[PDB]
Amino acid sequence: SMKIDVVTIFPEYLQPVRQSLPGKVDVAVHDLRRWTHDVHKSVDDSPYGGGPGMVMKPTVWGDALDEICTSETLLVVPTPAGYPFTQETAWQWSTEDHLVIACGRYEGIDQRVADDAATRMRVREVSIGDYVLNGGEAAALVIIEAVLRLVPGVSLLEGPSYTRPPSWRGMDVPPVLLSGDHAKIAAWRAEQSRQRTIERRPDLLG
Amino acid sequence: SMKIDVVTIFPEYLQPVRQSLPGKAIDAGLVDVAVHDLRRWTHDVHKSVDDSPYGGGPGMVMKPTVWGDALDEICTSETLLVVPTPAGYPFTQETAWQWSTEDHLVIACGRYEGIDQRVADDAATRMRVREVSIGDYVLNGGEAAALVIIEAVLRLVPGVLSLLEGPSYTRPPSWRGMDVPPVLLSGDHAKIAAWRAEQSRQRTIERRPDLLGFDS
Numbered sequence: 001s002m003k004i005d006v007v008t009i010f011p012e013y014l015q016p017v018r019q020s021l022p023g024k025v026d027v028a029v030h031d032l033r034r035w036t037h038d039v040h041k042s043v044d045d046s047p048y049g050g051g052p053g054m055v056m057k058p059t060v061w062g063d064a065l066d067e068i069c070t071s072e073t074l075l076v077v078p079t080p081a082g083y084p085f086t087q088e089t090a091w092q093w094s095t096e097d098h099l100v101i102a103c104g105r106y107e108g109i110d111q112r113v114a115d116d117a118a119t120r121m122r123v124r125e126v127s128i129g130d131y132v133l134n135g136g137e138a139a140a141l142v143i144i145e146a147v148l149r150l151v152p153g154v155s156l157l158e159g160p161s162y163t164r165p166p167s168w169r170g171m172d173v174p175p176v177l178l179s180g181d182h183a184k185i186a187a188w189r190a191e192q193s194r195q196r197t198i199e200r201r202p203d204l205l206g
Numbered sequence: 207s208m209k210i211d212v213v214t215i216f217p218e219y220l221q222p223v224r225q226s227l228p229g230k231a232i233d234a235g236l237v238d239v240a241v242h243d244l245r246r247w248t249h250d251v252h253k254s255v256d257d258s259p260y261g262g263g264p265g266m267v268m269k270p271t272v273w274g275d276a277l278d279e280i281c282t283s284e285t286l287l288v289v290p291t292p293a294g295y296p297f298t299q300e301t302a303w304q305w306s307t308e309d310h311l312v313i314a315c316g317r318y319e320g321i322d323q324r325v326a327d328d329a330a331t332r333m334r335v336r337e338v339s340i341g342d343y344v345l346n347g348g349e350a351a352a353l354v355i356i357e358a359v360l361r362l363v364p365g366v367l368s369l370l371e372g373p374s375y376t377r378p379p380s381w382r383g384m385d386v387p388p389v390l391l392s393g394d395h396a397k398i399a400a401w402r403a404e405q406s407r408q409r410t411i412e413r414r415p416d417l418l419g420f421d422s
């Protein structure tokens with residue numbers, strides 16, 4: 001039983017995830033502008049100390065999180081400056097009762113928001129990879145998917161996979177896979193995994 | 207002027223692309239993004255796209271026949287075929303810069319336990335193929351990875367306008383008894399630059415020591 005609240009200025013970005021859950025979990029999306037104070041519905045402002053872009057306003061985010069979060073909440077803040085989000089993270093968060101995901105522009109949410117929230121609840125600032133996105137929405141989709149697929153209801157790299165037909169455009173499925181020698185098949189797959197990992201992800205081997 | 211074709215069995219999942227930076231890029235005519243239902247290239251009643259793996263194992267593998275027909279129709283020799291997969295080469299910022307100058311990206315989204323390897327192998331005889339992962343975590347399908355790649359690449363395209371960035375602040379200067387670091391209010395560009403550099407170093411060593419050549 002997990003509740004996920006997502007807060008974003010692009011709520012429609014998150015709706016496909018909502019219309020993706022089978023038969024249960026609860027995922028709610030909130031337009032950040034609901035907590036703005038002015039008729040212009042301002043969510044960001046110029047950065048102190050100068051610089052390009054805008055920083056999201058602490059008064060707006062503070063009100064939103066005050067309403068949505070509780071002491072039991074794990075507040076997830078996607079940011080390119082975060083700790084890395086990994087499969088281990090996904091496993092850890094899969095047993096949480098309440099995730100709140102705060103989606104901001106990459107220039108950031110005023111740091112006092114996360115710092116204030118951390119005095120009352122658990123806060124996790126995380127990156128999903130080494131690339132820059134305009135905002136946290138796509139990263140939220142990745143996190144929601146990686147976490148929810150580990151909830152009951154819903155090393156080395158894996159090598160190549162094959163299915164019918166056995167011959168296709170002049171390429172045959174490796175005959176070992178058809179051999180009925182399942183110990184040999186396992187060893188072949190292990191070697192394919194070794195070769196692929198060396199080639200594509202040597203970092204996984206040290 | 208870039209064209210992106212995305213092929214998937216869940217074309218509805220790719221509608222978030224109609225928003226944010228990608229939506230604005232499309233509306234401004236800098237990119238055209240077209241989403242294709244893979245089942246359009248099936249010929250059986252049940253529109254089957256997957257089958258059990260040779261050699262055993264859990265789950266299903268996407269059929270090469272259907273993918274081959276789809277890619278035959280959509281790709282040319284000039285196409286960069288992008289195949290998101292957890293077993294791919296890493297997609298990084300460098301990759302995003304490289305692909306930002308391509309005329310034509312086709313993104314093949316897989317599901318179940320992946321796409322028959324011969325699809326990528328056959329395609330490579332006629333075009334450039336890149337199998338890529340967007341991070342070290344498990345997803346159900348390549349669709350969310352496609353959205354990440356599109357976002358990362360599109361914001362770099364001409365016309366659409368390291369270490370870790372440290373904390374940022376904006377008004378008011380005091381909030382809930384928490385003050386913006388006084389140096390940021392001082393207007394001293396030298397001192398501000400210095401403090402920001404120190405903040406970034408501190409954050410990088412704590413959160414991403416790998417970026418500076420340290421363990422973990």
Ligand SMILES: COc1ccc2nc[nH]c2c1
Pocket residue numbers: 078079080104105106126127128129130131132133134135136137139
């Ligand atoms: C722009 O916001 C984000 C959020 C998480 C991220 N992970 C990598 N880049 C990111 C950018």
Ligand SMILES: COc1ccc2nc[nH]c2c1
Pocket residue numbers: 290291292316338339340341342343344345346347348349351
């Ligand atoms: C299952 O499809 C994918 C595609 C790219 C990926 N990058 C990390 N996990 C991934 C899963």
